[PDB]
Amino acid sequence: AAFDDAVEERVINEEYKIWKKNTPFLYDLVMTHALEWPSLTAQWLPDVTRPEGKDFSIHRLVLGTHTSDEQNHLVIASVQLPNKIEIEIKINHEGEVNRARYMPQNPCIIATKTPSSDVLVFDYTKHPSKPDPSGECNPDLRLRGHQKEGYGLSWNPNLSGHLLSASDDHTICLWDISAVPKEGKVVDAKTIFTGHTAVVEDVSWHLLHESLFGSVADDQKLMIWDTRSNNTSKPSHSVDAHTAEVNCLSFNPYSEFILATGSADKTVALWDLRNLKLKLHSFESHKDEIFQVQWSPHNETILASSGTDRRLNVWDLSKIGEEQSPEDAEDGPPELLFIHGGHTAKISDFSWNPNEPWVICSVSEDNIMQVWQMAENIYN
Amino acid sequence: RRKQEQPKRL
């Protein structure tokens, strides 16, 4: 018992040695940073500073902590990228930061998921950069509605202040904070959606249609919801998406009918909203549960996925069905563009840089943050 | 189930 956890470490350490050796051929950029505590969350902020006549630019990241019995913080870090990684702000946070997402219409506004089931809202410019030594958490809003913690969190990019949240209590909560002064008010949910019968793992608004969002859960279902519908216990569409828990979904930012889901069944599924009866494709190479899937912000055929097998896989759906030499068919399907092997623990989250194509930040349970970019010859 | 039981400080 618990012995196989010892040799898998030995094999992990050997494959990481090989990966370090090959980085000059596979990567145009690799930066590794160890955080004091692991982050469960990562997301690039949308703005960049390009200081006068210097060869780099400064990008920022929302991170959090996951401590054991120590004060937690919401974290803004800065990264220098060519055309250094420093913590810039820590805000006191009650419990670990399950997930933090900035508001598209105002990226100073950051929503977080707490273990106590509260969803918190910070305007990070309304807080000192060094946290209150009391440790007391002073969020700008507290959003009530859940009875248990959760993970999914999604701001509507077309209706400002309309925030979705998924929870282990089997529900999805909607808040509209748009006319609520950000002075520590408590806001209860406008609507709670109850279609799922199990933990709801993720939720996401459609990028174009202001009334449409999807949810995925441990009941193996993808549900498509319309906020214009009066029935909140039954979604517009409900699909048996996977043979196990569905942990994540992402709408394609360029293709309004396409989305992707990732699952404990170790696959990423591709979906067309016009016919949810037929899975479009199943991306298979992961060796364990997938927890994050994200489409590229620059390239409509590119998406990436990560999870417990410590790999981050980048997929190119324009390559589905192309011929391979049997030596090439070895490493996997043609639509597998790249496998990032730099992490040695479960990957907790990743984010594509919105301003520097092909740059990704990924964070893992062993406190590692990596900012990396695969070699340009790999995506031509 | 998602979160590890004992995160470590560095």
Give me the residue from B3, B4, B10 closest to A36, CB to CB. Answer: B10
Other C-beta atoms closer than 10 Å to the C-beta of A218 total 19
Cited resolution, angstroms: 1.9
Residue among A37, A98, A151 minimizing CB distance to B7: A37
Residue in A140, A182, A146 with CA at minimum distance from that of residue A164: A146
Q: How far apart are CA A111 and CA A64, in angstroms?
A: 12
Residues of B in contact with A153 (CB under 8 A): none
Tokens describing residue A253: 């930012």
Query: Residue A190: how many CA atoms within 13 Å on its side-chain side?
Result: 14
Q: Residue A327: enclosing H or E segment and its boundaries?
A: helix A326-330
CA distance A145 to A187: 9
Residue A336: give the domain boundaries. Answer: 1-380
Distance of residue A348 Cα from the nearest chain B Cα, in angstroms: 9
| Contact (CB<8Å) B4/A70 | no
Which method resolved this structure?
A: X-ray
Alpha-carbon span A171 to A343, nearest angstrom: 33
> What is the rounded CA–CA span in Å between residue A270 and residue A241?
10
Taken as a whole, chain B contains a residue count of 10
- What would the two tokens of residue A281 be? 């494709």
Q: Quick check: A123 and A109 in contact, CB under 8 A?
A: yes
Q: Name the residue among A364, A344, A356, A315 with its Cα closest to residue A28.
A: A356
Q: What is the Cα–Cα distance from A85 to A97, expressed in whole angstroms?
A: 20
> Which residues make Cβ contacts (< 8 Å) with residue B5, sequence separation at least 6?
none
| Residue A4 dihedral angles phi and psi, to the nearest 5° | -60, -20
A291: chain B residues, CB-CB within 8 Å? 2
Q: Which long-range contacts (CB under 8 A, 24 or more apart) does A24-27 make?
A: A25/A375, A26/A338, A26/A374, A26/A375, A26/A378, A27/A372, A27/A373, A27/A374, A27/A375
CATH number of the domain within which A23 lies: 2.130.10.10
Q: Taking an 8 Å Cβ-Cβ cutoff, which residues of chain B contact chain A?
A: 2-4, 6-10
Q: Are A85 and A31 a contacting pair, CB within 8 Å? A: yes
Contact A163, A204 (CB under 8 A): no
Q: How far apart are the first and last CA of chain B?
A: 24
Query: How far, CA to CA in Å, does A361 sit from each of A116, A150, A244, A309, A374?
Result: 28, 23, 27, 17, 12
Domain count, chain A: 1
